[PDB]
Amino acid sequence: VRDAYIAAPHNCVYECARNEYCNDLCTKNGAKSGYCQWVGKYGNGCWCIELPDNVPIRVPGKCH
């Protein structure tokens, strides 16, 4: 497990307007919880706590 920005295809963050949007997205993918990160390594995007490792996360490189 790891805390990170969950990724949408391909290596893209999920932008967010609401914390609830991110908590729902993160927990439906197996995380403990989540929130909208407005300031972070990749800027605006959903951040998940304890996301299982079969689910993609934002890693260095370009969103494509």
From Swiss-Prot:
Impact after mutating R2A: 2.4-fold decrease in toxicity to mice, 15.2-fold decrease in activity on Nav1.5/SCN5A, and 43.3-fold decrease in activity on insect sodium channels
Annotated effect of mutating P52S: Not tested in mice, 1.2-fold decrease in activity on Nav1.5/SCN5A, and 16.9-fold decrease in activity on insect sodium channels
Effect annotated for changing H64A: 3.8-fold decrease in toxicity to mice, and 180-fold decrease in the binding affinity for insect sodium channels
Protein origin, superkingdom: Eukaryota
Positions of the LCN-type CS-alpha/beta domain: 2-64
Alphabetical UniProt keywords: Cardiotoxin, Disulfide bond, Ion channel impairing toxin, Neurotoxin, Secreted, Signal, Toxin, Voltage-gated sodium channel impairing toxin
Bridged cysteine pairs (disulfide): C12-C63, C16-C36, C22-C46, C26-C48
Effect of D3N: 1.4-fold increase in toxicity to mice, 1.4-fold increase in activity on Nav1.5/SCN5A, and 3.9-fold decrease in activity on insect sodium channels
Keyword Membrane assigned: no
One Gene Ontology term from the biological process aspect of the record: defense response
Compartments where located: Secreted
GO cellular component, one term: extracellular region
Record flagged with keyword Ribosomal protein: no
Consequence when changing G34A: 38-fold decrease in toxicity to mice, 11.2-fold decrease in activity on Nav1.5/SCN5A, and 43.3-fold decrease in activity on insect sodium channels
GO molecular function annotation: sodium channel inhibitor activity; toxin activity
Tissue specificity field: Expressed by the venom gland.
Effect in UniProt of substituting Y21G: 1.9-fold decrease in toxicity to mice, and 1.4-fold decrease in the binding affinity for insect sodium channels
Effect of H10Y: 2.2-fold decrease in toxicity to mice, 6.8-fold increase in activity on Nav1.5/SCN5A, and 1.8-fold decrease in activity on insect sodium channels
Function: Alpha toxins bind voltage-independently at site-3 of sodium channels (Nav) and inhibit the inactivation of the activated channels thereby blocking neuronal transmission. This toxin is active against both mammals and insects, and is classified as an alpha-like toxin. It is active on Nav1.2/SCN2A (EC(50)=139-252 nM), Nav1.3/SCN3A (EC(50)=565 nM), Nav1.4/SCN4A and Nav1.5/SCN5A (EC(50)=195-500 nM), Nav1.6/SCN8A (EC(50)=214 nM), and drosophila DmNav1 (EC(50)=30 nM).
Other comment: Exists in two forms, due to cis-trans isomerization at 28-Pro-His-29.
Free-text comment about domains: Has the structural arrangement of an alpha-helix connected to antiparallel beta-sheets by disulfide bonds (CS-alpha/beta).
Family stated for the protein in its record: Belongs to the long (4 C-C) scorpion toxin superfamily. Sodium channel inhibitor family. Alpha subfamily.
This protein's name: Alpha-like toxin BmK M1
Species this chain originates from: Olivierus martensii (Manchurian scorpion)
Range within the parent protein: 20 to 83 of 84
